[model samples]
Target chain A: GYEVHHQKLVFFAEDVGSNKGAIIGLMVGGVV
Target chain B: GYEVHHQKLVFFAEDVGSNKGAIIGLMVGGVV
Candidate 1:
């Protein structure tokens, strides 16, 4: 029931709650 | 060649710095 096609691992500079940090979220997207 | 056929994004509630966090990675697997 699962058919994944894209895979990756990203690390955010922000320490989760450190809003002042660089990033707070990630984007893993591609074709459908 | 990247012939992606599936896509998804999952977020971890654990802080990026807190080592005691629940998770810190992801898994995206399927067929070729």
Candidate 2:
């Protein structure tokens, strides 16, 4: 059976320093 | 069964321009 693969970006973050910083990125392509 | 599947950024471009264009950023996750 051919499964449907839906790629998605699961956003998450962690503290870099005392000052807040925006960690930005993305997710692309996949296979099923 | 466990399949060691992975996700990543296929292609990316980043540039900084003065009187030319702008800055671009991209990527995926920090995984293996």
Candidate 3:
């Protein structure tokens, strides 16, 4: 009863502010 | 403290299932 499609999401360092000394990274994966 | 950028998002009717007697629609807008 359902189907799947492709989706894309984009964000930047500005999307989330940086902390005092913590580093930030992005990872994306899924089952398709 | 941060920068802003442009983004694009795409979705399809298949992304979500059709409910029982329910309609689906999408609306997108924001301030930049």
Candidate 4:
């Protein structure tokens, strides 16, 4: 079974792409 | 929200061919 969905959230960021990038960066940092 | 990585597991046969090939085979077997 396969299902995919796109979701959006409102958040503050320092740059235009920072919101999504920060989420990813946070994950990597947590793992490392 | 819960987060997950869509990691793929691959399997391949190996030989004494090359170093990179050996590494890849090891990774595949490790995942499997």
Winning candidate number (DockQ): 1
DockQ of each: 0.14, 0.08, 0.04, 0.02
- In model 1, the number of clashes is 0
Pairs with steric clashes in candidate 3: none
The regions of model 4 sitting more than 4 angstroms off are A1-32, B1-4, B18-32
The alpha-carbon deviation from the true structure for residue A26 of candidate 4, after best TM-score superposition, in angstroms, is 21
* lDDT (Cα atoms) of all candidates against the true structure: 0.36, 0.28, 0.26, 0.25
TM-scores, in order shown?
Answer: 0.23, 0.21, 0.17, 0.19
lDDT of 1 at B21: 25
- Superposition error at B28 for model 3 (Å): 12
List, residue by residue over B1-32, the lDDT tens digit for candidate 4. Answer: 33334443333322223222112311211211
Question: Please, what are the lDDT tens digits per residue for candidate 4 over residues A1-32?
Answer: 22323433233323332121112211211311
Residue A20 of model 1 has an lDDT of 32
lDDT tens digits by residue: candidate 2, B1-32 = 11223444333233212212211123222221
Model 1 misses residue A4 by how many Å?
Answer: 1.4
Q: Considering only chain B, report the TM-score of each candidate against the true chain B.
A: 0.21, 0.17, 0.20, 0.20
The structural similarity of chain B in model 4 to the true chain B, as TM-score, is: 0.20
Candidate 1 residue runs with Cα over 4 Å from true position: A12-32, B1-21, B27-32
Best by TM-score: 1
Highest lDDT scorer: 1
Native interface contacts kept by each candidate, as a fraction: 0.14, 0.07, 0.02, 0.00
Better of 2 and 3 by TM-score: 2
TM-score of 1: 0.23
